[PDB]
Amino acid sequence: MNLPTAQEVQGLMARYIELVDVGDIEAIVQMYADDATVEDPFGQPPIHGREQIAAFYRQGLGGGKVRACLTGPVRASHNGCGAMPFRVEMVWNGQPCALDVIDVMRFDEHGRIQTMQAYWSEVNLSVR
Amino acid sequence: NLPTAQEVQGLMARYIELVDVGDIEAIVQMYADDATVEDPFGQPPIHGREQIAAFYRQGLGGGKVRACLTGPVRASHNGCGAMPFRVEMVWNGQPCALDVIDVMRFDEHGRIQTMQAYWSEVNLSVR
Ligand SMILES: [Cl-]
Ligand SMILES: [Cl-]
Ligand SMILES: [Mg+2]
Ligand SMILES: [Mg+2]
């Protein structure tokens, strides 16, 4: 693949959720560019490179008990970017928690996620 | 410093509220002087307070475009947020829907510095 057209952005971003949804940490990290960055949550400094991004997803996913699902359609541009709304269900002190998130991604000219920014803070964390 | 995350859920909601009711001056009053609009994302940015009016007067001048949040605003703690919504509008004279996510930053007074609107045709439907 080259720089993903808008339909290509959509399928990639939905796969990405499918991988979070099963917790294939290594297939996730192989969707990123070797020198990608992750800002998650957006505002905290960035995480550079596949090693660090791998350490980030293992800590987040390698537990407890994380599921994820789109909560509306992916919105894709014609320059290989996109944004998607989703909800992450996890376990916290045995209490089922959920977190509403939007991730923005910019891809590269091979269909690899070049930057990801995840929008959320505690206003989107609803403990039940 | 900057609006609190909770001040972001409020500003971005109010923005939606004003789109829907169609108020252009109340939209345009939300934009800091040096703001930019990228709508769609993948174009060139629009900057100039008359240019940004004008952009809201084309879209909205007909008086019948609606809009509403389709899920919660996601607000950061560095002045920014992102929201999903659905627009009702006219295209090819047929009622249509368009799904959109806007990302916004704000300033140090609660006005908009950058707006980015993500969508393309893959997000247009015909009713
Ligand atoms: Cl949605
Ligand atoms: Cl949502
Ligand atoms: Mg699944
Ligand atoms: Mg590269």
From Swiss-Prot, chain A:
GO MF, any single term: steroid Delta-isomerase activity
Annotated residues for binding of substrate: D103
Result after altering Y32S: Reduces activity 4-fold
Lineage top rank: taxon: Bacteria
Outcome when changing D103E: Slightly reduces activity. Reduces activity 10000-fold
Catalytic activity: a 3-oxo-Delta(5)-steroid = a 3-oxo-Delta(4)-steroid
Protein's recorded name: Steroid Delta-isomerase
The organism of origin for this protein: Pseudomonas putida (Arthrobacter siderocapsulatus)
The gene coding this protein: ksi
